[PDB]
Design a protein around this nucleic acid. Structure first.
Lengths: 87, 61, 212, 79, 81
RNA sequence: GUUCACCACGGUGUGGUUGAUGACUGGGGUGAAGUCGUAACAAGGUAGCCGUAGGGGAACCUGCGGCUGGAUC
RNA sequence: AAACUGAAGAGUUUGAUCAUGGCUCAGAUUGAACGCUGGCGGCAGGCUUAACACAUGCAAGUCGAGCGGUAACAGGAGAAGCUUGCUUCUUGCUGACGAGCGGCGGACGGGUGAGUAAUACUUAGGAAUCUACCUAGUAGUGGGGGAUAGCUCGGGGAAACUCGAAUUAAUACCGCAUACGACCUACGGGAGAAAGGGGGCUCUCGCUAUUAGAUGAGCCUAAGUCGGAUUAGCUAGAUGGUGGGGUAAAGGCCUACCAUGGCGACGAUCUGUAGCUGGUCUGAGAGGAUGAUCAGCCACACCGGGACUGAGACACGGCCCGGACUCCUACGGGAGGCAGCAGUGGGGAAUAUUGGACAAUGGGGGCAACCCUGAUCCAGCCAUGCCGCGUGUGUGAAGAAGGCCUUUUGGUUGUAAAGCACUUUAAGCAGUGAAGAAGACUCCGUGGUUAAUACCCACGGACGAUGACAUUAGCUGCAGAAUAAGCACCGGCUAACUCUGUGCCAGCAGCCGCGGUAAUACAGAGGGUGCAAGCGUUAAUCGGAAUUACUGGGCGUAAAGGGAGCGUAGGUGGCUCGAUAAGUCAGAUGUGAAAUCCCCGGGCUUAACCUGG
């Protein structure tokens, strides 16, 4: 970077990306549980994994980590495969 | 290519730097260019008076 | 540019009087050579071609008004585009030039001296509708229906203007122009009609030449 | 909205047909109208129409890679 | 945002603006949305020096555009007479 | 951090296309007071021409079929 | 009312002719080059080649009214050595302000045309999307926590920079609390925000969730859009479907399985070439050629790849990795990308200043003040083009001299010159002098606001703070013809003819051709012709060329009927009564950007130019 602000915007980007990648990774782990519980066809474990994911999944969509439309879509599509899994 | 040196007299030898324009010479087979007189190394025709600009000759004072 | 050289060898090349000399002497007395074209031979053999009676007819109109080819080929382009006959719209644009009109009105002994009056800021034009008398130094101003010409106060006592009037009265004054000698003022009432200029100019040869 | 009519030249795809629409595009210099044709793959949800039928197809949102039209009516059928 | 601004025309030392509705990021003389008049800085006392279609200048204000400080004054000194 | 997946550079092998060059070689053209003939144009002195085959320093010749764009009849 | 106006041929095959048919020419045009010459102004244009490599300067900052603060700076208050008017040290106390955290901008504006023959462009539509700033709404803006940059303390490094310990603020970050909308829902219910600052409890700038606009972006469909068949077969995530993933969003975009599809002589595939358009040149038109400057779209930013942040980038002057090159180094390591504006080297036939200012129109930041802006507005260089003006004007004959020809005496240069009388455009000199400026600030008044006559905002007055250009444009005076003409051609085409020299030599030439001792064709002169601050030459496009013929040609013998037939695709197709309305025609509507072209006007003294409909 050749100018002060360009140098500042660059060191301001590693900070804004480490912080938002520890939250991007958080969104993913909480969905591994919902996909690991579905893979073992367990409604009781999946609903208890889908239930502790909604608050994570959409709190991080209000923050900007993922888009609300991805948060809605992940909720819908996961609720459509547990509801069908011997409701 | 081979170009035609028009005018009465010239000062061209090997390694002379010349400007070449288009225009063929009817009587000469395989000559389709004219060397520009006065351009870079080619000198204007020495004692020209009438068609001076066609032979790179300055207006006589 | 304009043509500076001798004027009575232009006429002689055209074979007619071009008004390039103030009418104090008869045309055949000012030159006395006006039977043979200028130069060594002049009057000789060779049969002139169709292109030669076309070039000489357009060269003649150009020499009369003092206009060079580029300004004169623009006139033919204005006259062709313009509605109506081309060779009559052309003769109107040339007769509506401001430097031509201060000679048809009597303030210039000849168009070359009337060119020397318009150019030297000694002639004011007033566009019809406006009320101010602007000074101009452009010979090629196209006058329109109602424009009023007047001599500049600084040069209203000109010794060369005073005798240009005297000599114009013998030549006459057109009907499409109203002149006032006492007030050194005129009026371009109307562009001249085809039947208000000499019938020796063949404008059909001019339009014929500008089509290759 | 934007309906198009043509024959069915292929129907050997699941919920899909190939429709041949004919047009008379006029030569831009010689003025003769040349009858040209394009193959448009439409979507037949119930997979009912066969090849050789007249079908109306309307433009819709794309359903596949090279399929964005859908069957709306079968005016004519194979004789 | 959308802006109602002037786009320079005319010639050297002889400007002639056309009041224009455009996206604010487009070049001054570039792409616009609608042309709604003109403006002669150097004009005569018997010539239309300012003209502006007031029906779309208002349509475009209830719609979101933001006039520039030169056109807002231009309207301000054109509807007063 | 480690490891796996994807992947850029890079490497390897084998082909295709294409430019410039190449001893030598083929015909094409231009150039003079050349050498050998005289094939065609007249019935051009064996009518010419087409396809094909054989032959011959070279134009060309000969056979077979065809044509008149062949004169004399 | 008007946009409705436009069409030329010649030379050259022959002893001669007519036809055929090529070649050449006269025209227009240029981002032009070169040769000779060169006065001025206005308006445009100016690296077409190396998307070659780039020295140096500038081209993106701004906010202290988010925050801790105090490196400089200027003050202010007190210490006053007081050295009596020298003068310093403490203090963020104030104007402000370097670095730092934070916000907005940097995705625009500007450049280029390498790639790209189709994720492009043009035209017409569509639905499955997101959208900072802006407009109009709706519900809010509650309450806590843990950090951390700068600042310290100690190191490492030649530098670039860096490592550790301690640690403060915030509109930085993270919980918790609520939620009109909004999201998921099995529709029973579940989960999700934010931040404060400023002016005198208010108002305002903000922030949060969201609706509808507008704007912008992404996506899709159909039609159109270069050449080659001496490139005919092309495809295996390939064609379609389902489950799942992925996206802001449809979709083989990805994936597993299932089927075996999809495209192609209406040109797939492979090649070569190219940014596309409005437009530009040409042309009577139809066409042909082209895609500079202006505007729209696209793509690219030393080369290959990946992403981050963000409303928006896979980012021209941002990040990471790799590479080539250039540079610095203490040899361990580092830095950089003018296809921004100037400019350099190089390449080239060839294309400019390392200029001024943010005054105007815009853009970024800010409450403003104000700052930034090589966008832009101007200035500089260049006859590169278009347009305009000038280089004088009248009068002057036993028709002077000099040149040239000549029948030796006439002709011609020629009213041309001289002489005489004028004029001062342009340039020069001196004055004067608009307009580009939008009237910021400050003050008053009115209205809204309010608890309020504060504040804020809107409106109405006063006032003059603001001009780079600039010594402006213009206008008025002074002087003196004073400072200002060249280029090509003159056998025919093609306007314009004679001598002298030369002797198939020297040379000319677009073509036909000229030159071999009397050359209108070479070279020089005189005279003339055409253009003119230009004139010629070369390059290039169209024209003439009806010479690819659609408009608008031919095929017995001039080039040209396939050796003949059968026949596929295709093209075309009898009569009569119906139906349909696709083609066809008409009408309406939407659209066909602006500019350009044309018509009618209007402003530059005219014109070029600008401009309204």
């Amino acid at each position: 970077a050749n100018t002060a602000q360009a140098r500042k915007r660059a060191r301001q980007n590693t900070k804004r990306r480490q912080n938002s990648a520890s939250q991007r990774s958080m969104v993913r782990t909480y969905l591994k549980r919902v996909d690991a519980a579905i893979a073992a066809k367990d409604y009781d474990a999946a609903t208890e994994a889908y239930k502790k994911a909604i608050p994570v999944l959409d709190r991080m969509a209000d923050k900007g980590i993922i888009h609300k439309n991805k948060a809605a879509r992940r909720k819908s599509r996961l609720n459509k495969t547990i509801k069908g899994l011997q409701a | 290519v081979s170009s035609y040196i028009g005018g009465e007299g010239h000062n061209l030898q090997e390694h002379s730097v010349v400007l070449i324009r288009g225009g063929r010479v009817k009587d000469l087979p395989g000559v389709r260019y004219h060397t520009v007189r006065g351009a870079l190394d080619c000198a204007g025709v020495k004692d020209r008076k009438q068609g001076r600009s066609k032979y790179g000759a300055k207006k006589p004072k | 540019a304009r043509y500076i050289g001798p004027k009575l060898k232009l006429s002689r090349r055209e074979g007619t009087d071009l008004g390039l000399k103030s009418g104090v002497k008869p045309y055949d007395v000012k030159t006395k050579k006006a039977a043979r074209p200028p130069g060594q031979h002049g009057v000789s053999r060779n049969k002139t071609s169709e292109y030669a009676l076309q070039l000489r007819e357009k060269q003649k109109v150009k020499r009369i008004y003092g206009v060079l080819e580029r300004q004169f080929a623009n006139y033919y382009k204005e006259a062709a585009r313009k509605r109506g006959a081309t060779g009559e719209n052309l003769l109107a644009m040339l007769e509506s030039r401001l430097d031509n009109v201060v000679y048809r009105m009597g303030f210039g002994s000849t168009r070359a001296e009337a060119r020397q009056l318009v150019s030297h800021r000694t002639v004011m034009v007033k566009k019809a509708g406006r009320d101010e008398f602007v000074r101009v130094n452009i010979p090629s101003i196209q006058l329109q229906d109602g424009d009023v010409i007047a001599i500049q106060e600084k040069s209203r006592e000109q010794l060369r203007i005073k005798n240009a009037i005297e000599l114009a009265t013998q030549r006459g004054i057109p009907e499409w122009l109203d002149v006032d000698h006492s007030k050194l003022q005129g009026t371009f009432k109307k562009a001249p009609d085809r039947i208000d200029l000499p019938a020796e100019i063949n404008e059909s040869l001019i339009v014929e030449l500008y089509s290759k | 909205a934007s309906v198009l009519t043509g024959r069915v030249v292929s129907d050997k795809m699941d919920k899909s047909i190939t429709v041949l629409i004919e047009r008379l595009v006029r030569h831009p210099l010689y003025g003769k109208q040349l009858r040209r044709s394009t193959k448009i793959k439409a979507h037949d949800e119930n997979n009912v129409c066969q090849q050789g039928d007249l079908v109306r197809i309307k433009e819709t949102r794309p359903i596949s890679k090279t399929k964005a039209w859908t069957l709306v009516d079968v005016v004519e059928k194979v004789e | 945002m959308v802006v109602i601004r002037l786009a320079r025309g005319g010639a050297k030392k002889r400007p002639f603006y056309q009041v224009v509705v455009a996206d604010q990021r487009r070049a001054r003389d570039g792409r616009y949305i609608e042309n709604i008049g003109f403006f002669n800085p150097l004009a005569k006392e018997s010539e239309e020096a300012v003209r502006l279609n007031m029906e779309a200048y208002h349509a475009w204000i209830a719609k979101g555009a933001q006039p520039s400080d030169r056109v807002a004054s231009l309207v301000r000194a054109y509807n007063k007479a």
